[PDB]
Ligand binder design. Structure first.
Ligand SMILES: [Mg+2]
Ligand SMILES: [Mg+2]
Lengths: 189, 189
């Protein structure tokens, strides 16, 4: 499995909630680390940060090591654009990504996609094509609406009830590790 | 005929040539005027300025006065996003666009698309579905190759012969002036 992480570095996320976020991620990588599993991370906002590719991870496969040194981005939310860059570069052959393997994407966001030229319509359709499975963790009040949830039901793979986890706040992410974990195991064993 | 212009305001355009382009536009809108014609203007770079809308035109049908105050935006070349907006905002009924009218668009730019999240692959198609006729004018030494002009043909309608025009300097736009004018009359008569 080519398991990649897309995390929201929006400056709407207070340093420690962002601290937490970061700890969540380390933990799941260690928790899902099979032998042939690869990992990659990028930090998206208004600027886009590749912290590491599959290709790298295999010559230093240590979640605590690589997760540790990340720096927040603060800008706004270009989720769609972020998606396009995952598919477009993370999941490319020269980046470690292996062709006969499962493509998995886990997104973590705290708001709605603000000020993005692209849309889900522009990026969604090409993610399916190469067949990327998408699981979305949405965090906070921003997601309590009868429309905010739509954006989340949308970045997800179908069915959405099994791909979406609407948590209450940074702390409260520890609460779904077993879930998010077992769902990603079941599709490899 | 709902006729709209997209003028490149990038930083590579020196101020006297930016003034030359502003002249061209005023003039052509003059020459192409008829009682049923409406004109719209947008300048793009990295930012996007809608100078006058279809229905605001019909509030002060005066090319010349309307073009006078236009100051240069200074960005870089985000041409696809520009096409998008032209198509999404200007040929919008609420911005005065008429249901049974023709939709002609004239693009003028001194460069290659650069650092644009969108591809022409994401805009050309919306432009076709909405029946938008595109003419491209590529000014300067950027479209100097059997390659960069290939940008022009992609943007422009088919056959490419008829919809593309390239001139060496701004000061030469005056040369394709009469040939353009006519092209845009064979649509209507
Ligand atoms: Mg946020
Ligand atoms: Mg330029």
């Amino acid at each position: 499995s080519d398991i990649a992480f897309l995390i929201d570095g929006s400056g709407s996320i207070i340093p420690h909630d962002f601290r937490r976020m970061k700890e969540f991620v380390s933990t799941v990588m260690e928790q899902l680390k099979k032998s042939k599993t690869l990992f990659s991370l990028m930090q998206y906002s208004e600027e886009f940060r590749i912290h590491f590719t599959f290709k790298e991870f295999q010559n230093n496969p240590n979640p605590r090591s690589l997760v540790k040194p990340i720096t927040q981005l603060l800008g706004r939310t270009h989720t769609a654009t972020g998606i396009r860059k995952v598919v477009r570069e993370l999941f490319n052959i020269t980046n470690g990504a292996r062709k006969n393997a499962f493509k998995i994407l886990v997104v973590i966001t705290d708001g709605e996609k603000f000020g993005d030229p692209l849309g889900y319509e522009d990026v969604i359709p090409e993610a399916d094509r190469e067949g990327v499975i998408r699981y979305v963790i949405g965090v906070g009040d921003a997601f309590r609406s009868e429309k905010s949830r739509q954006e989340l039901n949308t970045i997800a793979s179908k069915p959405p009830r099994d791909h979406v986890f609407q948590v209450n706040n940074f702390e409260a992410l520890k609460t779904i590790q077993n879930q998010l974990r077992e769902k990603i195991f079941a599709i490899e064993g």
